[PDB]
Design a protein around this nucleic acid. Structure first.
Ligand SMILES: CC[C@H]1OC(=O)[C@H](C)[C@@H](O[C@H]2C[C@@](C)(OC)[C@@H](O)[C@H](C)O2)[C@H](C)[C@@H](O[C@@H]2O[C@H](C)C[C@H](N(C)C)[C@H]2O)[C@](C)(O)C[C@@H](C)C(=O)[C@H](C)[C@@H](O)[C@]1(C)O
Ligand SMILES: [Mg+2]
Ligand SMILES: [Mg+2]
Ligand SMILES: [Mg+2]
Ligand SMILES: [Mg+2]
Ligand SMILES: [Mg+2]
Ligand SMILES: [Mg+2]
Ligand SMILES: [Mg+2]
Ligand SMILES: [Mg+2]
Ligand SMILES: [Mg+2]
Ligand SMILES: [Mg+2]
Ligand SMILES: [Mg+2]
Ligand SMILES: [Mg+2]
Ligand SMILES: [Mg+2]
Ligand SMILES: [Mg+2]
Ligand SMILES: [Mg+2]
Ligand SMILES: [Mg+2]
Ligand SMILES: [Mg+2]
Ligand SMILES: [Mg+2]
Ligand SMILES: [Mg+2]
Ligand SMILES: [Mg+2]
Ligand SMILES: [Mg+2]
Ligand SMILES: [Mg+2]
Ligand SMILES: [Mg+2]
Ligand SMILES: [Mg+2]
Ligand SMILES: [Mg+2]
Ligand SMILES: [Mg+2]
Ligand SMILES: [Mg+2]
Ligand SMILES: [Mg+2]
Ligand SMILES: [Mg+2]
Ligand SMILES: [Mg+2]
Ligand SMILES: [Mg+2]
Ligand SMILES: [Mg+2]
Ligand SMILES: [Mg+2]
Ligand SMILES: [Mg+2]
Ligand SMILES: [Mg+2]
Ligand SMILES: [Mg+2]
Ligand SMILES: [Mg+2]
Ligand SMILES: [Mg+2]
Ligand SMILES: [Mg+2]
Ligand SMILES: [Mg+2]
Ligand SMILES: [Mg+2]
Ligand SMILES: [Mg+2]
Ligand SMILES: [Mg+2]
Ligand SMILES: [Mg+2]
Ligand SMILES: [Mg+2]
Ligand SMILES: [Mg+2]
Ligand SMILES: [Mg+2]
Ligand SMILES: [Mg+2]
Ligand SMILES: [Mg+2]
Ligand SMILES: [Mg+2]
Ligand SMILES: [Mg+2]
Ligand SMILES: [Mg+2]
Ligand SMILES: [Mg+2]
Ligand SMILES: [Mg+2]
Ligand SMILES: [Mg+2]
Ligand SMILES: [Mg+2]
Ligand SMILES: [Mg+2]
Ligand SMILES: [Mg+2]
Ligand SMILES: [Mg+2]
Ligand SMILES: [Mg+2]
Ligand SMILES: [Mg+2]
Ligand SMILES: [Mg+2]
Ligand SMILES: [Mg+2]
Ligand SMILES: [Mg+2]
Ligand SMILES: [Mg+2]
Ligand SMILES: [Mg+2]
Ligand SMILES: [Mg+2]
Ligand SMILES: [Mg+2]
Ligand SMILES: [Mg+2]
Ligand SMILES: [Mg+2]
Ligand SMILES: [Mg+2]
Ligand SMILES: [Mg+2]
Ligand SMILES: [Mg+2]
Ligand SMILES: [Mg+2]
Ligand SMILES: [Mg+2]
Ligand SMILES: [Mg+2]
Ligand SMILES: [Mg+2]
Ligand SMILES: [Mg+2]
Ligand SMILES: [Mg+2]
Ligand SMILES: [Mg+2]
Ligand SMILES: [Mg+2]
Ligand SMILES: [Mg+2]
Ligand SMILES: [Mg+2]
Ligand SMILES: [Mg+2]
Ligand SMILES: [Mg+2]
Ligand SMILES: [Mg+2]
Ligand SMILES: [Mg+2]
Ligand SMILES: [Mg+2]
Ligand SMILES: [Mg+2]
Ligand SMILES: [Mg+2]
Ligand SMILES: [Mg+2]
Ligand SMILES: [Mg+2]
Ligand SMILES: [Mg+2]
Ligand SMILES: [Mg+2]
Ligand SMILES: [Mg+2]
Ligand SMILES: [Mg+2]
Ligand SMILES: [Mg+2]
Ligand SMILES: [Mg+2]
Ligand SMILES: [Mg+2]
Ligand SMILES: [Mg+2]
Ligand SMILES: [Mg+2]
Ligand SMILES: [Mg+2]
Ligand SMILES: [Mg+2]
Ligand SMILES: [Mg+2]
Ligand SMILES: [Mg+2]
Ligand SMILES: [Mg+2]
Ligand SMILES: [Mg+2]
Ligand SMILES: [Mg+2]
Ligand SMILES: [Mg+2]
Ligand SMILES: [Mg+2]
Ligand SMILES: [Mg+2]
Ligand SMILES: [Mg+2]
Ligand SMILES: [Mg+2]
Ligand SMILES: [Mg+2]
Ligand SMILES: [Mg+2]
Ligand SMILES: [Mg+2]
Ligand SMILES: [Mg+2]
Ligand SMILES: [Mg+2]
Ligand SMILES: [Mg+2]
Ligand SMILES: [Mg+2]
Ligand SMILES: [Mg+2]
Ligand SMILES: [Mg+2]
Ligand SMILES: [Mg+2]
Ligand SMILES: [Mg+2]
Ligand SMILES: [Mg+2]
Ligand SMILES: [Mg+2]
Ligand SMILES: [Mg+2]
Ligand SMILES: [Mg+2]
Ligand SMILES: [Mg+2]
Ligand SMILES: [Mg+2]
Ligand SMILES: [Mg+2]
Ligand SMILES: [Mg+2]
Ligand SMILES: [Mg+2]
Ligand SMILES: [Mg+2]
Ligand SMILES: [Mg+2]
Ligand SMILES: [Mg+2]
Ligand SMILES: [Mg+2]
Ligand SMILES: [Mg+2]
Ligand SMILES: [Mg+2]
Ligand SMILES: [Mg+2]
Ligand SMILES: [Mg+2]
Ligand SMILES: [Mg+2]
Ligand SMILES: [Mg+2]
Ligand SMILES: [Mg+2]
Ligand SMILES: [Mg+2]
Ligand SMILES: [Mg+2]
Ligand SMILES: [Mg+2]
Ligand SMILES: [Mg+2]
Ligand SMILES: [Mg+2]
Ligand SMILES: [Mg+2]
Ligand SMILES: [Mg+2]
Ligand SMILES: [Mg+2]
Ligand SMILES: [Mg+2]
Ligand SMILES: [Mg+2]
Ligand SMILES: [Mg+2]
Ligand SMILES: [Mg+2]
Ligand SMILES: [Mg+2]
Ligand SMILES: [Mg+2]
Ligand SMILES: [Mg+2]
Ligand SMILES: [Mg+2]
Ligand SMILES: [Mg+2]
Ligand SMILES: [Mg+2]
Ligand SMILES: [Mg+2]
Ligand SMILES: [Mg+2]
Ligand SMILES: [Mg+2]
Ligand SMILES: [Mg+2]
Ligand SMILES: [Mg+2]
Ligand SMILES: [Mg+2]
Ligand SMILES: [Mg+2]
Ligand SMILES: [Mg+2]
Ligand SMILES: [Mg+2]
Ligand SMILES: [Mg+2]
Ligand SMILES: [Mg+2]
Ligand SMILES: [Mg+2]
Ligand SMILES: [Mg+2]
Ligand SMILES: [Mg+2]
Ligand SMILES: [Mg+2]
Ligand SMILES: [Mg+2]
Ligand SMILES: [Mg+2]
Ligand SMILES: [Mg+2]
Ligand SMILES: [Mg+2]
Ligand SMILES: [Mg+2]
Ligand SMILES: [Mg+2]
Ligand SMILES: [Mg+2]
Ligand SMILES: [Mg+2]
Ligand SMILES: [Mg+2]
Ligand SMILES: [Mg+2]
Ligand SMILES: [Mg+2]
Ligand SMILES: [Mg+2]
Ligand SMILES: [Mg+2]
Ligand SMILES: [Mg+2]
Ligand SMILES: [Mg+2]
Ligand SMILES: [Mg+2]
Ligand SMILES: [Mg+2]
Ligand SMILES: [Mg+2]
Ligand SMILES: [Mg+2]
Ligand SMILES: [Mg+2]
Ligand SMILES: [Mg+2]
Ligand SMILES: [Mg+2]
Ligand SMILES: [Mg+2]
Ligand SMILES: [Mg+2]
Ligand SMILES: [Mg+2]
Ligand SMILES: [Mg+2]
Ligand SMILES: [Mg+2]
Ligand SMILES: [Mg+2]
Ligand SMILES: [Mg+2]
Ligand SMILES: [Mg+2]
Ligand SMILES: [Mg+2]
Ligand SMILES: [Mg+2]
Ligand SMILES: [Mg+2]
Ligand SMILES: [Mg+2]
Ligand SMILES: [Mg+2]
Ligand SMILES: [Mg+2]
Ligand SMILES: [Mg+2]
Ligand SMILES: [Mg+2]
Ligand SMILES: [Mg+2]
Ligand SMILES: [Mg+2]
Ligand SMILES: [Mg+2]
Ligand SMILES: [Mg+2]
Ligand SMILES: [Mg+2]
Ligand SMILES: [Mg+2]
Ligand SMILES: [Mg+2]
Ligand SMILES: [Mg+2]
Ligand SMILES: [Mg+2]
Ligand SMILES: [Mg+2]
Ligand SMILES: [Mg+2]
Ligand SMILES: [Mg+2]
Ligand SMILES: [Mg+2]
Ligand SMILES: [Mg+2]
Ligand SMILES: [Mg+2]
Ligand SMILES: [Mg+2]
Ligand SMILES: [Mg+2]
Ligand SMILES: [Mg+2]
Ligand SMILES: [Mg+2]
Ligand SMILES: [Mg+2]
Ligand SMILES: [Mg+2]
Ligand SMILES: [Mg+2]
Ligand SMILES: [Mg+2]
Ligand SMILES: [Mg+2]
Ligand SMILES: [Mg+2]
Ligand SMILES: [Mg+2]
Ligand SMILES: [Mg+2]
Ligand SMILES: [Mg+2]
Ligand SMILES: [Mg+2]
Ligand SMILES: [Mg+2]
Ligand SMILES: [Mg+2]
Ligand SMILES: [Mg+2]
Ligand SMILES: [Mg+2]
Ligand SMILES: [Mg+2]
Lengths: 48, 275
RNA sequence: CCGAGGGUAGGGCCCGUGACUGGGGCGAAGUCGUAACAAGGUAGCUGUACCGGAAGGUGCGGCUGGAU
RNA sequence: UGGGAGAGGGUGGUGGAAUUCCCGGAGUAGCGGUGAAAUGCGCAGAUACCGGGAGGAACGCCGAUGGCGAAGGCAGCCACCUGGUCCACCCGUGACGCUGAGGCGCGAAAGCGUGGGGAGCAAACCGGAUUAGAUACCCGGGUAGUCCACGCCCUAAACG
RNA sequence: CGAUGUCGGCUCGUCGCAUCCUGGGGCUGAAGAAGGUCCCAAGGGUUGGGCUGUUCGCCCAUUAAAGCGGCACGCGAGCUG
RNA sequence: GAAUGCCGGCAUGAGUAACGAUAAAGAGGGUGAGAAUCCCUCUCGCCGUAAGCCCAAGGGUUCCUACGCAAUGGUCGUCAGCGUAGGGUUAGGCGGGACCUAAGGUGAAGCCGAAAGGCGUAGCCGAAGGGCAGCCGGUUAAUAUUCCGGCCCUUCCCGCAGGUGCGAUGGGGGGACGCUCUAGGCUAGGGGGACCGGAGCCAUGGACGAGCCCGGCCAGAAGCGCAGGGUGGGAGGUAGGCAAAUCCGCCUCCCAACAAGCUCUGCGUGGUGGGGAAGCCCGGGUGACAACCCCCCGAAGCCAGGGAGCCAAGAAAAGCCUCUAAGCACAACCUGCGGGAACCCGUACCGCAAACCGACACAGGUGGGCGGGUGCAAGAGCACUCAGGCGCGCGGGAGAACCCUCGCCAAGGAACUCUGCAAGUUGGCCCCGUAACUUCGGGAGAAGGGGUGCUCCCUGGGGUGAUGAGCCCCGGGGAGCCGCAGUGAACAGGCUCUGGCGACUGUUUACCAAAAACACAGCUCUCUGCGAACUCGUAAGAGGAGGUAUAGGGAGCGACGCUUGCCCGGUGCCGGAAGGUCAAGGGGAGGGGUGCAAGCCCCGAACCGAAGCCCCGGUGAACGGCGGCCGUAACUAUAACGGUCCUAAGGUAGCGAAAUUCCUUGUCGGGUAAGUUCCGACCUGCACGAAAAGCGUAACGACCGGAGCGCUGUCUCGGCGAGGGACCCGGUGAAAUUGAACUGGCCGUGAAGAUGCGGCCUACCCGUGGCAGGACGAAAAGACCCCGUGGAGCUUUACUGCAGCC
RNA sequence: GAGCUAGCCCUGGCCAGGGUGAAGCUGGGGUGAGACCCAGUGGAGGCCCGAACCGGUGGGGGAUGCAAACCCCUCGGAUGA
């Protein structure tokens, strides 16, 4: 059947992307939080 | 005169449609239509704030001249009478000797090829717009301003009309389409006559799908729901209201008046409404 | 080929009969009231409508075959 | 050809009286109703009186024992549209007439449909009396309906 | 109760005997035939249908007979539902 | 040593289940240490509206080539989407950007919010919509509308010539629009040819033929032709298009008028440039100077912004044209010609799948285009086939039970069973024919029947063409032939009668319920006069609605028909300027503390004092409710009738053992051989009843009941046959479970159902295929049930608060 | 977190083929004029049959599955909510 993951590069970037995160307070805490943890990636890579 | 159908489908039994026999032009004036941004009943929050809306036919909005005192003393010919999916009435296209073109709500009896006019000097004729204080007492009027220069606000729906009953000072007494008696200011404009397409109320939609064409999604009864949803939810099997019949949000919906009591227009309501 | 008729399927009309049901007629001495005949004690009759245990009543309109 | 009379019919207008309600004033202790009463209404200001407004229906005197229509029926007043009828002349056609199974149409009231209107009246209904009872007569309320438009129904003591 | 699946049916049987039939008897208000009732006897047998989920029961047609109970109201790691 | 403990290691089940669609394989040759599995060939089979092809998304080197086989591949492996290495994606015209706007998003102005932030006009962003310049062939192992060849075209800059009041974010036009049906002419695509081109072939009885086989085109600028789209011309006035205006709009006149003309597209032709089969010979080369012609069918595509009808009334903005304003008229713009300039990113490959989403090379999921031929009435259905792609990454055997899918069956024919569940039957087309009832549409494919192939003969009309032949499409009549059977295969309704419920088409518990539930047109009540009511929000602001009582919100009922009674005492709601109660506040009789005192300070009576509540009315398609005992008729029985008690009023019409009836399988009737169900009645209705609507109702239903016919393996009652498994051999090889185990029956005992205790009986050791009675077998710390001063959802005239409203 | 699912907004796309034959229009009849009748033309509809597509009615299989919802047969809608 149709499952829950239907990859869409534009949907991915526009929802979890770097610019999406900077635009809101909870987003900047996410970025700060993942930067403090030392994540190699702050955001899901999508190829555009 | 409404038009019936033979029962060649179950829904054709009762479906009735307007006769459309007063319409003389069947596509809108390009310079007077604009996109009608469908809402679905959602507000700028994105929330359903008026339930069961959406999915109607696409429409363009015909810009309607609700002032008319824009152009005192400039007559206009009635070029056409047209369909307008945004209101019950029909609309009439006016060609001004000015050269300018506008739409008005089409009054009952208006004929293509007649000249209408607007202003204190105007004749007491169907389609003429005068300030209220210059129409003789007893004249049936429509498209009435509630406040001076604020725009036609009353008696705009197919078949409706307000009637002039008498005068008091700077103010006129109108019997509204609801039968209330309200004082309207004399400098307010009104158009002689009643709105057209009176047959509009005798239309029999005929089937569920036709309501879906008008943007009307299905209504769900409280009794058919669950208590998380509505006062009337729940119960094993069917059930009476079991409380005073209530809206989705708790308030009582049989008789409970809801006009705000101290509202300033109350000084101008002579009598509440009829029937 | 036609063909008595036999068969299959479906219709029309009549007859008889049927739990039950509807009023009808008749029946020396039942029960309830008293509608009509006198101005019958609310003049009567009427077509219709609504209503009531029952006759009837009431409304709307009509007639005189109504009285004094 | 020329005359007249008439609530003949249809449409659009429009006039005053009266009832009801609403507003203002004035005013006070009852009003209403009956056979007698009660219900009901009334100091929370009724009734009775004056000014104002709205709305519906009916059309006083004329009015008659009258008139018109085929019948059912038709009554303020105005205009328009239309039917029938009678009379004078003796002008035209030449028996072109009579009736009329079927047909078609019209057809009081009540009643039905879809809208509108709703003052007064009033089936149903409620209450008050009367009564043995009173699903009545009498009284106080009262919804259809009575009114309009269209469409049905097509009945009668539709009688002379 | 860190689970013993719970009616009926179907299938498959097995056992008891307080025996429905068939075998053997005594008594009889046993003439014969037919029964009635008690005794001995569990080897075998103990039908097909209509109704109801039904067990049971009633009814139809037969039958020598149309037995009554146990086996976790036998049998859902065998089926049904 | 235990915590269904945690982490890890290793066992058991076990050489067991499985090895992922039953579309299918066989052999020869090759390679190699090694071959059912790689490579080549021949044979066979499968898909062919796909299992072939092309785009898009997503994936991200998986592409191509060399070299490998430890691991990955469900076996194998020499192969590979695997390992290693090298190579490979080329654009002014394709797609996106340097263009436009849509929802939405953002947001100078502005507004709002404790902070964070929420809004918001313009403007900006935003596409698979608008707009805009490339077609055919060749080329590589791998890219091509990208490279090359041919023929075309676009924009920008500069210059030249001719022309003109030039000039814009501004005005205007246009862009610019639905659904259904559809005309004319084309094109794509297809069929045929006795014509044209071709390497050949003659078999096995015949055929050297008007034989068989193959193939007979593609692109193309100007012009031209055919078909279409679009489009009045001129003059005068002019206050409207937020300045201007010669433009547009409005008014008058003249002229034109299906036209034509002007313009823009499609199609055809077209210089020119391409391609070009079978077969044969080792992808190539030949064929080949290949031929490239005629007839027919023909789009859903094209002309197109075409036509008609209908109601539900069908984007925006730029490009573009036109008007003028500042300005500028040595300019500028338009037109033709010439030279020059033309950037960024994508391009490999998979793409209904082994490369995407499903943990897997997973029988599932994934949007658009192309989708050939024959026949079957049509078609994208069905069967077989073309191109092209496959045989599904374990095999070889055997021919038990049993299971799955499938075929047949004597006689019977629902006797099966909860139920004809399941499976039979029926089945397309053409003709005849077709009932109650009905809202006149229907019910209807009712039911029920007949026809159906092939040959010959005569014949009617239509399309193309020409009016003919030829081809193609609909038919009619006659005479015959063969079989068991002619929609000979494949696809393709069993029917009827009767009841309940819901009017109907729809909708729903993704993944146990599709229904009688929800919805629905329709009816009623009620709120709402517009800064509407109501909704969301602290607000601003939105929705409502760019709507206005024929409208919008809320509630119930649910097409339609005939209807919807009585109760307003209680709760709600509505009306009521009296009265009664009533908070803060006002008032301040009169008391108090302190000070020597002027003073300061405290308590405080009557009285005035909202809404709400009390109280007076109304109100049922508002919440709701609609009685009890006793007596009575000239047989009995039963009471039309009466008495009395209570009530706010005591259930009307209609319906009734019912989706409701307990006693109940009520009683009677029908249907049956037999009927707890069904249907029709009766009415002492445990416990129908009138918009939580009552009684009906044609048509409709994968709803639920009862009956009949047809027909059957459902059954008496089972038999046989097919394939895929099970079984045997070679390869690979799980699992839950498991205190250890050297693990028998009976009768007892035992915490009450013992392999494990007592007594007896039985029993050599170990496996394999089977069956499920036991191991209170496995799975899941019982969902039932209770307990816990555990939890959560829900309700109200429980408590206490809050929003909101007054 | 609305890349699943639910609703709405904007913009595109899709629905082989057959069958039934509403209004309207035309002609004929009818009539004082009408209503209306007949034929033809027409092509309406939450119309009928049936693929794609969207569903999921009944049964069987599957149940450490091919699959944490699948497979076969059958069945509903298929111009419309
Ligand atoms: C398909 C495969 C599934 O099996 C079933 O569906 C069968 C058919 C259920 O019966 C179904 C069907 C049915 C009718 O039972 C027969 C119904 O009663 C129960 C509730 O579920 C089972 C076995 C249930 O057991 C029963 O649960 C009962 C509550 C108690 C009973 N026993 C202890 C007394 C016990 O055996 C139960 C709980 O689902 C099993 C647990 C372990 C599961 O969750 C497992 C994972 C199942 O999902 C499953 C194995 O995957
Ligand atoms: Mg899904
Ligand atoms: Mg994307
Ligand atoms: Mg995208
Ligand atoms: Mg997106
Ligand atoms: Mg982003
Ligand atoms: Mg976002
Ligand atoms: Mg921000
Ligand atoms: Mg910060
Ligand atoms: Mg790093
Ligand atoms: Mg992040
Ligand atoms: Mg109709
Ligand atoms: Mg009809
Ligand atoms: Mg109109
Ligand atoms: Mg525009
Ligand atoms: Mg909006
Ligand atoms: Mg917004
Ligand atoms: Mg937001
Ligand atoms: Mg939000
Ligand atoms: Mg709402
Ligand atoms: Mg809504
Ligand atoms: Mg309109
Ligand atoms: Mg409107
Ligand atoms: Mg005013
Ligand atoms: Mg309506
Ligand atoms: Mg609409
Ligand atoms: Mg609605
Ligand atoms: Mg509803
Ligand atoms: Mg409910
Ligand atoms: Mg519910
Ligand atoms: Mg919720
Ligand atoms: Mg709650
Ligand atoms: Mg609640
Ligand atoms: Mg409730
Ligand atoms: Mg409920
Ligand atoms: Mg419920
Ligand atoms: Mg209940
Ligand atoms: Mg209740
Ligand atoms: Mg309530
Ligand atoms: Mg409120
Ligand atoms: Mg009012
Ligand atoms: Mg007596
Ligand atoms: Mg008498
Ligand atoms: Mg009398
Ligand atoms: Mg009397
Ligand atoms: Mg009476
Ligand atoms: Mg008083
Ligand atoms: Mg007083
Ligand atoms: Mg009035
Ligand atoms: Mg003479
Ligand atoms: Mg009384
Ligand atoms: Mg008395
Ligand atoms: Mg009459
Ligand atoms: Mg237990
Ligand atoms: Mg355990
Ligand atoms: Mg367990
Ligand atoms: Mg059996
Ligand atoms: Mg004897
Ligand atoms: Mg004897
Ligand atoms: Mg003895
Ligand atoms: Mg024995
Ligand atoms: Mg039992
Ligand atoms: Mg029993
Ligand atoms: Mg015997
Ligand atoms: Mg037994
Ligand atoms: Mg026992
Ligand atoms: Mg047990
Ligand atoms: Mg027991
Ligand atoms: Mg028991
Ligand atoms: Mg048992
Ligand atoms: Mg058992
Ligand atoms: Mg079981
Ligand atoms: Mg069982
Ligand atoms: Mg078990
Ligand atoms: Mg077992
Ligand atoms: Mg067991
Ligand atoms: Mg220990
Ligand atoms: Mg464990
Ligand atoms: Mg633990
Ligand atoms: Mg562990
Ligand atoms: Mg561990
Ligand atoms: Mg481990
Ligand atoms: Mg380790
Ligand atoms: Mg290990
Ligand atoms: Mg092992
Ligand atoms: Mg084993
Ligand atoms: Mg296994
Ligand atoms: Mg497997
Ligand atoms: Mg398959
Ligand atoms: Mg081989
Ligand atoms: Mg071979
Ligand atoms: Mg090798
Ligand atoms: Mg090999
Ligand atoms: Mg090998
Ligand atoms: Mg192989
Ligand atoms: Mg090979
Ligand atoms: Mg990947
Ligand atoms: Mg390897
Ligand atoms: Mg290997
Ligand atoms: Mg190696
Ligand atoms: Mg491997
Ligand atoms: Mg694998
Ligand atoms: Mg490559
Ligand atoms: Mg640039
Ligand atoms: Mg912050
Ligand atoms: Mg954006
Ligand atoms: Mg382009
Ligand atoms: Mg080109
Ligand atoms: Mg090369
Ligand atoms: Mg020059
Ligand atoms: Mg210029
Ligand atoms: Mg346009
Ligand atoms: Mg438009
Ligand atoms: Mg568009
Ligand atoms: Mg449409
Ligand atoms: Mg063809
Ligand atoms: Mg060409
Ligand atoms: Mg001007
Ligand atoms: Mg074009
Ligand atoms: Mg070649
Ligand atoms: Mg050559
Ligand atoms: Mg298409
Ligand atoms: Mg077009
Ligand atoms: Mg816009
Ligand atoms: Mg200047
Ligand atoms: Mg200069
Ligand atoms: Mg120029
Ligand atoms: Mg650049
Ligand atoms: Mg490429
Ligand atoms: Mg697929
Ligand atoms: Mg595809
Ligand atoms: Mg692949
Ligand atoms: Mg996942
Ligand atoms: Mg595979
Ligand atoms: Mg796959
Ligand atoms: Mg066919
Ligand atoms: Mg295979
Ligand atoms: Mg396959
Ligand atoms: Mg094998
Ligand atoms: Mg074997
Ligand atoms: Mg198979
Ligand atoms: Mg066969
Ligand atoms: Mg047989
Ligand atoms: Mg039979
Ligand atoms: Mg038979
Ligand atoms: Mg049966
Ligand atoms: Mg049955
Ligand atoms: Mg069959
Ligand atoms: Mg067939
Ligand atoms: Mg018939
Ligand atoms: Mg019949
Ligand atoms: Mg029938
Ligand atoms: Mg019937
Ligand atoms: Mg009929
Ligand atoms: Mg037929
Ligand atoms: Mg037939
Ligand atoms: Mg024949
Ligand atoms: Mg043949
Ligand atoms: Mg033969
Ligand atoms: Mg069929
Ligand atoms: Mg339904
Ligand atoms: Mg339903
Ligand atoms: Mg119903
Ligand atoms: Mg109905
Ligand atoms: Mg319904
Ligand atoms: Mg449908
Ligand atoms: Mg479900
Ligand atoms: Mg569920
Ligand atoms: Mg689920
Ligand atoms: Mg299911
Ligand atoms: Mg359900
Ligand atoms: Mg269904
Ligand atoms: Mg539902
Ligand atoms: Mg209704
Ligand atoms: Mg209403
Ligand atoms: Mg709120
Ligand atoms: Mg705040
Ligand atoms: Mg708005
Ligand atoms: Mg209804
Ligand atoms: Mg309905
Ligand atoms: Mg409903
Ligand atoms: Mg009827
Ligand atoms: Mg009450
Ligand atoms: Mg009350
Ligand atoms: Mg009261
Ligand atoms: Mg109550
Ligand atoms: Mg009560
Ligand atoms: Mg009644
Ligand atoms: Mg019963
Ligand atoms: Mg009964
Ligand atoms: Mg019933
Ligand atoms: Mg009951
Ligand atoms: Mg019972
Ligand atoms: Mg019985
Ligand atoms: Mg019987
Ligand atoms: Mg009884
Ligand atoms: Mg109710
Ligand atoms: Mg109920
Ligand atoms: Mg019915
Ligand atoms: Mg019916
Ligand atoms: Mg249905
Ligand atoms: Mg159904
Ligand atoms: Mg049967
Ligand atoms: Mg039978
Ligand atoms: Mg069998
Ligand atoms: Mg076999
Ligand atoms: Mg061996
Ligand atoms: Mg091995
Ligand atoms: Mg291996
Ligand atoms: Mg041990
Ligand atoms: Mg041991
Ligand atoms: Mg052992
Ligand atoms: Mg043993
Ligand atoms: Mg014991
Ligand atoms: Mg024991
Ligand atoms: Mg032992
Ligand atoms: Mg031991
Ligand atoms: Mg011991
Ligand atoms: Mg022992
Ligand atoms: Mg021992
Ligand atoms: Mg032993
Ligand atoms: Mg073995
Ligand atoms: Mg075995
Ligand atoms: Mg066992
Ligand atoms: Mg245990
Ligand atoms: Mg066991
Ligand atoms: Mg056990
Ligand atoms: Mg636990
Ligand atoms: Mg527990
Ligand atoms: Mg549990
Ligand atoms: Mg529970
Ligand atoms: Mg317990
Ligand atoms: Mg406690
Ligand atoms: Mg405790
Ligand atoms: Mg607790
Ligand atoms: Mg709680
Ligand atoms: Mg997605
Ligand atoms: Mg379709
Ligand atoms: Mg279709
Ligand atoms: Mg289409
Ligand atoms: Mg079609
Ligand atoms: Mg026709
Ligand atoms: Mg027409
Ligand atoms: Mg349809
Ligand atoms: Mg059909
Ligand atoms: Mg089946
Ligand atoms: Mg499962
Ligand atoms: Mg499937
Ligand atoms: Mg199938
Ligand atoms: Mg269909």
């Amino acid at each position: 059947m149709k499952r829950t993951w239907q990859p869409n590069r534009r949907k991915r970037a526009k929802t979890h992307g770097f610019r999406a995160r900077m635009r809101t307070p909870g987003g900047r805490k996410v970025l700060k939080r993942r930067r403090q943890k030392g994540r190699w990636r702050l955001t899901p890579a999508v190829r555009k | 005169a409404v038009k019936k159908f033979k029962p060649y489908t179950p829904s054709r039994r009762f479906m009735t449609v307007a006769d459309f026999s007063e319409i003389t032009k069947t596509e809108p004036e390009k310079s007077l239509v604009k996109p009608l941004k469908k809402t679905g009943g959602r507000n700028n929050q994105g929330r359903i704030t008026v339930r069961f809306r959406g999915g109607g036919h696409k429409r363009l909005y015909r810009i309607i001249d609700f002032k008319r005192w824009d152009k005192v003393g400039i007559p206009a010919k009635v070029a056409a009478i047209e369909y307008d999916p945004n209101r019950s009435a029909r609309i009439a296209l006016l060609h001004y000797v000015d050269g300018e073109k506008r739409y008005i709500i089409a009054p009952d009896g208006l004929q293509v090829g007649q000249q209408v006019v607007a202003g204190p000097d105007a004749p007491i004729q169907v389609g003429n717009a005068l300030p209220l204080r210059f129409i003789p007492v007893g004249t049936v009027v429509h498209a009435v301003e509630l406040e001076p220069k604020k725009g036609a606000k009353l008696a705009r729906a197919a078949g409706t009309s307000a009637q002039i009953q008498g005068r008091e000072g700077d103010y006129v007494i109108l019997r509204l389409p609801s039968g209330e008696l309200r004082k309207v200011h004399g400098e307010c404009y009104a158009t002689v006559g009643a709105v057209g397409n009176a047959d509009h109320k005798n239309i029999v939609l005929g089937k569920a799908g036709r309501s879906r064409w008008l943007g009307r999604r299905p209504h769900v009864r409280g009794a058919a729901m669950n208590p998380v949803d509505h006062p009337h939810g729940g119960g094993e099997g069917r059930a009476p209201r079991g409380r005073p019949p209530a809206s989705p949000w708790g308030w009582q919906t049989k008789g409970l008046k809801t006009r705000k009591r101290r509202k300033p227009s109350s000084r101008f309501i002579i009598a509440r409404r009829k029937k």
